Design a protein around this ligand. Structure first.
Ligand SMILES: CC(C)[C@@H]1NC(=O)[C@]2(C)CSC(=N2)c2cccc(n2)CNC(=O)C[C@@H](/C=C/CCS)NC1=O
Ligand SMILES: [K+]
Ligand SMILES: [K+]
Ligand SMILES: [Zn+2]
Length: 361
């Protein structure tokens, strides 16, 4: 079975319509297209999310506000839209397209159309039920998981974005049918502030939330050791039936965030380990603010999913000029120190290992 690739020219243009991260969705698809990887996948046109589908997580008051300002424009209520005053009218359609695409990919998984479904323009994990947050206006990850819960009894959410996927974790904080695992930078003052190793969920969902606080400057080898160690324990204890994987590329060297020092090869190993489970897997994007590097990463990861080694030279295409001055696919880690102490890392792993002992199905 070939991977499902959620794409349409109308979808890509809609994903860039807010211009929060200028033409990233187009650059990502164009590079994938330039390597002709789409030829090896099953292209699926995304459906648009209805009001009811989006309301499975987001409140009516929030959604109705987005639809209203799409029609009329912006003591007003706080929905986290204070940075979009010049243009709020396109947010509702953006959210509906983002939401619909991830739901579509999830439905493909349910229908048995594939084992892997890809939506690189999704993975907006910060959005709350009643407010936007961190460039996330709608949490498609939550909508995707909720859709998969119709078919699969236990869902594992893995968030490899630089930031803590607080929106997704809070959505399922009280349930034990969905386990969230997040690897992220954790430091006083760093967005979004949550996701300490001691945060393990609430009520029936206690110990069904896993957080791995990491410090600046981590590289491929250390990251994969940490990630494999956690996933190994999580898989054995929770025994997931489906996986939703968020692959925010703002961990990659060269990103304006300038925190982690990763390359796409390191992320690719984590992905390879997850794919090894051969479970129904929903692949999502997320953060990534070095445009060319994000296209580089997600194109490489697409190659990993297809089990193909791409040529090192960036092929000529629409955005070829943006890949200078090297014009290659490989990304070189920065000359920046690793702030992660080995003893602290082992403590965290042991702490999590203790937590997962409580998890028994
Ligand atoms: C400029 C930079 C800080 C940028 N910010 C913004 O572009 C705006 C829209 C302008 S000022 C601002 N937001 C802001 C002010 C106070 C507090 C926060 N943000 C907390 N939120 C974040 O830090 C999200 C964080 C993005 C997280 C992506 C997670 S995948 N954003 C930013 O890095
Ligand atoms: K994360
Ligand atoms: K949970
Ligand atoms: Zn991020």
């Amino acid at each position: 079975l070939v991977p499902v690739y959620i794409y349409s020219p109308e979808y890509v243009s809609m994903c860039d319509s807010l211009a929060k991260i200028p033409k990233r969705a187009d650059m990502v698809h164009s590079l994938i297209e330039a390597y002709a990887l789409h030829k090896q996948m099953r292209i699926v046109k995304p459906k648009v999310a209805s009001m009811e589908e989006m309301a499975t997580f987001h409140t009516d008051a929030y959604l109705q506000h987005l639809q209203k300002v799409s029609q009329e424009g912006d003591d007003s209520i706080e929905y986290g839209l204070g940075y979009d005053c010049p243009a709020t009218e396109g947010i509702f359609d953006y959210a509906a397209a983002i939401g619909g695409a991830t739901i579509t990919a999830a439905q493909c998984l349910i229908d048995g159309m594939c084992k892997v479904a890809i939506n690189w323009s999704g993975g907006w994990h910060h959005a709350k039920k009643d407010e936007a947050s961190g460039f996330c206006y709608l949490n498609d990850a939550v909508l995707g998981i909720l859709r998969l819960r119709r078919k699969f009894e236990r869902i594992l959410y893995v968030d490899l974005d630089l930031h803590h996927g607080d929106g997704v974790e809070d959505a399922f904080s009280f349930t034990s049918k969905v386990m969230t695992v997040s690897l992220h930078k954790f430091s006083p003052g760093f967005f979004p502030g949550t996701g300490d190793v001691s945060d393990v969920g609430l009520g029936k969902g206690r110990y069904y939330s896993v957080n791995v606080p990491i410090q600046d400057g981590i590289q491929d080898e250390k990251y994969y050791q940490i990630c494999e160690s956690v996933l190994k324990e999580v898989y054995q204890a929770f025994n997931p039936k489906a996986v939703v994987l968020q692959l925010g590329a703002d961990t990659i060297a060269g990103d304006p965030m300038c925190s982690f020092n990763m390359t796409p090869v390191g992320i690719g190993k984590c992905l390879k380990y997850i794919l090894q489970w051969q479970l129904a897997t929903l692949i999502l994007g997320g953060g990534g603010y070095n445009l060319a590097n994000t296209a580089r990463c997600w194109t490489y990861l697409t190659g990993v999913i297809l089990g193909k080694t791409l040529s090192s030279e960036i092929p000529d295409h629409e955005f070829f000029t943006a890949y200078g001055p090297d014009y290659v696919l490989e990304i070189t880690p920065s000359c920046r120190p690793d702030r992660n102490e080995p003893h602290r890392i082992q403590q965290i792993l042991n702490y999590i290992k203790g937590n997962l002992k409580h998890v028994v199905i």
